[PDB]
DNA sequence: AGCTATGAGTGGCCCCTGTGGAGAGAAG
DNA sequence: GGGGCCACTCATAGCT
RNA sequence: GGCUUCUCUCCACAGGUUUUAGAGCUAGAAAUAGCAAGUUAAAAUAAGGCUAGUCCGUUAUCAACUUGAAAAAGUGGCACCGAGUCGGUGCU
């Protein structure tokens, strides 16, 4: 009597529940076998558990992870570009300084050269450290000298500013002479009324240097500058000029009459020719005043980011680092002085104290600026003479280093031009600097276009780079290998989505004339007319439909049912009186991209040949694909000959955006084999018929279903393994989809095979994906009339249905008692699910059997903690390197350990070196997994042990389970930790009260159940202490935590006098020290409780081991006990 | 008987962070 | 959030 | 309509840490006390891998046993009864 049954689900992002449910709702359980070598052979399980398992993580941390690596890697490259530009000279004059960098790292011990890493003699160390006290002296001295400089202090500017070289954010040079806000502000408007004498503006007294470098938003500011304005507006001429200067992006259209948008924008790549679009609509006597505008800007800018404007150089940073640390040193010296004279009692502590947040913690410590400021402020105000320290603690500017995070926002043209200032100045003394300039300025400037990727040949997953030669590529040879057009359209197209009717093929992009077309004669085709003599609506023929495109869909932007009755039907059909059905206003298809070539080629012949179609299609796609315009003037540049100069200029500044749904292959690529005709030519003509698309594609007396679904991938089970990844979504839910779908699969297996008549579904808040994904593998037989059997019925339910049928019959809940409400709650969705289609919920509730089950991950990811700790004389500290022993180098710390394996063997002790047979586990870090399932027997005598037993060899990732006496269990953290692994379990009485209680007030309902919930509440102050009587029963059972138990015992007697829901919030509290997984410090009322952390795993080597399934249901139970005995 | 080495328990502290530009998608 | 590490004390095995 | 959620991929950037370099002085045998100084740089930023790439290394996958290089396939009885992390009656 094969059973009915059904399977239900609770999906979440950090726990998948399942459940097996039958006619009766029971929950049945089955005697599964214990396979292994204890006394126990089998257990009788519950079909219900709940998965748990690490969240899963997005691919977010490990790719800017990847983004870091990439950098440090072409950071690391160009360092040796530069090096090997350097090498040939660097050898005249000092061979070994590119191995004494690389050694500096090293202690003096280690290094083959002298320790000194730039001069290798100490009176010139002296000599530096007294001439340039930092590096940016430096880099003013060699900007600046004329003089022969030495080799390696430009190698050492140079190397700064390549690996330092700033941000991106602004293309087209810079000047950095232009910084001053206010005189370039009253220079603008005196050049605007010069332009304009007609009509000038005031704005004497109006502090632009102030308003325009506030800290505040780029809208606000120029509100507040227009304000001082008087007669001025902000989307005046005038204002929008004043927004350019902001880096806005202000629409011109309103200013000059334009019948087009003229918007433009400084920060763009294209500023220049759009304001040569301007200038060609407007004239060219506004150029000055847009140049004046960019200069503003430039200065605006700039003066965000320097402060000094009063000192004249070429270097406008090296002079602001060199003055910010001329304060520090001046202020640091007045400020002793002071505390000298007047507070001698808090020198140390200042000055000398390291531990502390003062100017030793700032600077000598590791305490930053904002805690300096802090700690600094209170006793600047308990001084005399202070009043400049203090205005500069507020401005930020006291005692300032000189590397800080404000650093950020210095464009990289001020290194550039830094750069080619050093570049100009040294290339007369030493030739190959002169020969290499554009190199080396390459290299500074040289950035791998973000539509080209990862250089690689074919060995990488994330690259997509198409090449013409296989040459090196090196950044004087980029353009010459790879082909950026071809780069860029791959670029492009590998993340456009395929088609969904035809997956093979790719989308159209949205301007697309054909698509323009498709839609256009789409729309026309259900369009119905009535005229005076007809008894029932007509659809338009095909010639009516050309005609009426021809007439108005070529010769108007937007078409209305209007404008179509007065141009069509009464002029050209001479119908007076026409009723149109199927389109209400107007016509929600648009020839725009025609309208737009008609305006820009204007030759409409050209435009309305069939045999241009072809040409144009690629034109639109050059368009859609490339944002950079040199890719599509160089692909165009095939069509020059069909087109003169004005128009292709005209071509290159128009762009276009989206990517549309169909291909060209489903529109005009395929012909019905009966007739020949595309979807298209349908469209345009089907005579009586007058099919639409979705009719076309559903037509069985045409083959284009035929060619759908022959196209359509028929293909087997390909990779049910990234099959489910492909779906939209978090990573999360992607990993829950498949550890749901695998515990379906271990489900069916454990029934007997037989298939359930049901599934019961839910998601955590995407559903249908997962839904289809199941019963896909569920339903796969065919009758008769190869129509699908469906045996397996799939439903899929929301939490409010479940939600609202818990509480009407009040099956309620907690979230923070323990982890068996997943599986509760997949039982309720599987009853809820039926009831689409009462003891036993509570009796489901009640089980304590319930199959939790960690999921035994062998952990990846981070080999240690990215904190590199202090050199110390201790064992545990990890080497950042083969020859860095940490005792010597200090490095990482806190090893992620992969898993442990139980190793029986015999090691020395002691001095005598006597041999000792010895049962532990070792645990085996991730940066050594690979070397351990290379070769186990060396690795482990590596570490020292003996007559290795290989047959005894158990691996045992984090999360493995152990069990001991009384069932205590504990969770392999690591190699020296443990976790509680024991599932506390309240009956639902306490379950009730917990939440009613804790949720006192916050909880809105009617009177009657307020006062309901008042007087459960109260008479269960006798449940208040056996709920903690519970927890110590169960601590003595299996935390053995007596010292903390004893602590909450007398907090919890200590206030009692409190009332009951002040209690309850932190009686609930009490469960972070039972609840399964790592112990959590939690506080009780005032009272705050330690930790209870278990470093002792020697109880478990004598311990019987547990493996179970995904779902625990099949388990081999292993005894260690009975192994490692002699 | 006394000195040193060594394993178990307990209380405390620590852990990389911030930003910008471009593209393409699901769902609201 | 949680595993790792250290400073500290105490019981106990070992040793003579 | 836009700009939102959320994901991927790519391009860059400013820090942070470690270890070393930036000669600490005086009195005192030393412990130690007084004084002076604190702003920068190099290297590394997951050990490393062979396909030697300006690529790859934290995403995802992974109970145990048999076969298989691996993918992958197979491996374990059910019912009644009562059912705290489980046991009995028939029966396989």
Redesign the pocket.
């Known amino acids: 009597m094969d ?1 009915k049954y059904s399977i239900g689900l609770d999906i979440g992002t950090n726990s998948v529940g399942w459940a097996v449910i039958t006619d009766e709702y ?1 929950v ?8 292994g070598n204890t006394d ?1 052979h ?5 079909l219900i558990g709940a998965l748990l398992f690490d969240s ?24 040796c570009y530069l090096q090997e530009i350097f090498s040939n000279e660097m050898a005249k004059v000092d061979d070994s300084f590119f191995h004494r ?2 050694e ?5 011990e280690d290094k083959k050269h002298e ?4 001069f290798g003699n ?2 010139d ?2 000599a530096y ?1 007294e001439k340039y ?4 002296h430096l880099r003013k001295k060699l900007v600046d000298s004329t003089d022969k400089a030495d080799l390696r202090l430009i190698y ?1 500017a140079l ?2 500013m390549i ?7 602004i293309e087209g040079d810079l000047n950095p002479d232009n910084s001053d806000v206010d005189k370039l502000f009253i220079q603008l408007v005196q050049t605007y009324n010069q332009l304009f004498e007609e009509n000038p503006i005031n704005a004497s007294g109006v502090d632009a240097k102030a308003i325009l470098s506030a800290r505040l938003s780029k809208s606000r500011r120029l509100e507040n500058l227009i304000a001082q304005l008087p007669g001025e507006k902000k989307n005046g001429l005038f204002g929008n000029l004043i927004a350019l200067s902001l880096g806005l992006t202000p629409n011109f259209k309103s200013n000059f009459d334009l019948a087009e948008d003229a918007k433009l924008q400084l920060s763009k790549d294209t500023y220049d020719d759009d304001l040569d679009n301007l200038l060609a609509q407007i004239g060219d006597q506004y150029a000055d005043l847009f140049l004046a505008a960019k200069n503003l800007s430039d200065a605006i800018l700039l003066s965000d980011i320097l402060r000094v404007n009063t000192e004249i150089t070429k270097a406008p940073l090296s002079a602001s680092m060199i003055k ?2 001329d304060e ?2 001046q202020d ?2 007045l400020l ?1 002085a002071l505390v ?1 004279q007047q507070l ?1 009692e808090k ?2 502590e ?5 531990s502390k947040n003062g ?2 913690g ?5 305490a ?1 600026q904002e805690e300096f400021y802090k700690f600094i402020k209170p006793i600047l105000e308990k001084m005399d003479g202070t009043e400049e320290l203090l205005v500069k603690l507020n401005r930020e500017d006291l ?10 926002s ?1 464009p ?1 043209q001020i290194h550039l031009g830094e750069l080619h200032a050093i570049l100009r100045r040294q290339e007369d003394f030493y030739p190959f600097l002169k020969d290499n300039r554009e190199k080396i300025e390459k290299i500074l400037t ?12 074919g ?5 997509w780079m198409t090449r013409k030669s296989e040459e ?4 004087w040879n ?1 353009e010459e290998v790879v082909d950026k057009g071809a780069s860029a359209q791959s670029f ?1 197209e590998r ?3 395929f088609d969904k009717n035809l997956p093979n093929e790719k ?1 159209l992009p949205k301007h697309s004339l054909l698509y323009e077309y498709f839609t256009v004669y789409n729309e026309l085709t259900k369009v119905k007319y009535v005229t005076e003599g007809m008894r029932k609506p007509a659809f338009l023929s095909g010639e009516q439909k050309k005609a009426i495109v021809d007439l108005l869909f070529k010769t108007n932007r937007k078409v209305t049912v209007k404008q179509l009755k007065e141009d069509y039907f009464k002029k050209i059909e001479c119908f007076d009186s026409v009723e149109i059905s199927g389109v209400e206003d107007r016509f929600n298809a648009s020839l725009g991209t025609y309208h737009d070539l008609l305006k820009i080629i204007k030759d409409k012949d050209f435009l309305d040949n069939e045999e241009n179609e072809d040409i144009l299609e690629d034109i639109v796609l050059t368009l ?1 694909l490339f ?1 950079d315009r040199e890719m599509i003037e160089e692909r165009l540049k095939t069509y020059a000959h069909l087109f003169d100069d004005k128009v292709m200029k005209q071509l290159k500044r128009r762009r276009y ?3 549309g749904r169909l291909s060209r292959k489903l529109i005009n690529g395929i012909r019905d084999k009966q007739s020949g005709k595309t979807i298209l030519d349908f469209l345009k003509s089907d005579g009586f018929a007058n099919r639409n698309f979705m009719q076309l594609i559903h037509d069985d007396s045409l083959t284009f279903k035929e060619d759908i679904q022959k196209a359509q991938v028929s293909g087997q089970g390909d990779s ?3 099959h489910i ?1 492909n779906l ?4 999360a839910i ?2 829950g989809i ?2 749901t779908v ?1 515990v379906v699969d271990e489900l069916v ?2 029934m ?1 095979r037989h298939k359930p008549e049901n599934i019961v579904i839910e998601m955590a808040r ?1 559903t249908k994906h997962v839904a289809q994904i199941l019963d896909s593998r569920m339903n796969t037989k065919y009758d008769e009339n190869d129509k699908l059997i469906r045996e397996v019925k799939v439903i899929t339910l929301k939490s409010k249905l479940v939600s609202d049928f818990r509480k009407d019959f009040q099956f309620y809940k907690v979230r923070e008692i323990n982890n068996y409400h997943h599986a509760h709650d997949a039982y309720l969705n599987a009853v809820v699910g039926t009831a689409l289609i009462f003891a036993t919920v509570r ?1 489901v509730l ?4 319930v199959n939790i089950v960690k ?18 004389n ?1 064992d ?8 860095w022993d940490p005792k ?10 992969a898993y442990s394996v139980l190793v029986v063997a015999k090691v020395e ?2 001095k ?1 070196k006597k041999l000792k047979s010895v049962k532990e586990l070792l ?1 085996i870090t ?3 997994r ?2 351990f399932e290379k070769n186990p027997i060396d690795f482990l005598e590596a570490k020292g042990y003996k007559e290795v037993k290989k047959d005894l060899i158990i ?1 045992l ?1 984090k999360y493995s389970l152990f069990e001991l006496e009384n ?1 205590r269990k504990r969770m392999l ?5 443990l ?1 509680k692994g024991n599932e506390l ?1 309240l009956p639902s009485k306490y379950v009730n009260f917990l939440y009613l209680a804790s949720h006192y007030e916050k909880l809105k309902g009617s009177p009657e159940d307020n006062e309901q919930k008042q007087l459960f509440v109260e008479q269960h102050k006798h449940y208040l202490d056996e709920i903690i009587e519970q927890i110590s029963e169960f601590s003595k059972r299996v935390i053995l ?4 138990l004893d602590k909450v015992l007398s907090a919890y007697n200590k206030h009692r006098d409190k009332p009951i829901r002040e209690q309850a919030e932190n009686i609930i509290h009490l469960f972070t020290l039972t609840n399964l ?4 410090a939690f506080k009780y009322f005032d009272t705050t409780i ?1 930790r ?5 795993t ?1 109880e478990v080597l004598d311990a019987t081991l547990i ?4 779902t625990g249901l ?3 139970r292993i005894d260690l006990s009975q192994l490692g005995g002699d």
Request: no cysteine; proline share 5%.
């Open positions: 059973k029971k049945p359980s089955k005697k599964f076998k214990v396979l126990r089998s257990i009788k399980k519950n899963g993580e997005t691919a977010e941390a490990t790719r800017l992870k990847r983004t870091a690596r990439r950098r440090y890697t072409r950071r690391k490259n160009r360092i960098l690389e500096s790292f090293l202690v003096e320790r000194h890493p730039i100490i009176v160390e002296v450290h006290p930092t590096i940016y050492l190397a700064h690996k330092f070289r700033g941000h991106f954010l910010r640390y520090h040193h640091l010296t002793k000298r001698p020198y140390k200042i000055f000398f104290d390291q100017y030793a700032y600077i000598d410590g590791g930053s005692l300032r280093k000189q590397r800080t995070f404000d650093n950020g210095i990289h040289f950035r791998i276009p973000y539509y080209v990727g990862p250089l690689a040949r060995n990488s997953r994330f690259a090196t590529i090196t950044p980029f492009i993340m456009t989505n989308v859609t944002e955006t989206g990517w049910l393994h990234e990844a939209a979504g978090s990573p992607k990993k498949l550890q695998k297996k454990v007997g995407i009796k009640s089980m304590p059997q999921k035994t991950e062998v952990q990846t990811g981070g080999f240690s903690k990215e904190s590199i700790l202090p050199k110390r201790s545990k500290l990890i080497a950042r390197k083969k020859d010597k180098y200090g490095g990482f710390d806190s090893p992620t350990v002790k002691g005598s645990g991730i940066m050594e690979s070397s691996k990732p069932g953290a690591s190699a020296g930790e976790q379990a935590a007596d010292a903390n997984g790592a112990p959590a330690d209870k952390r278990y470093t002792s020697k493996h179970q399934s995904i099949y388990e081999t």
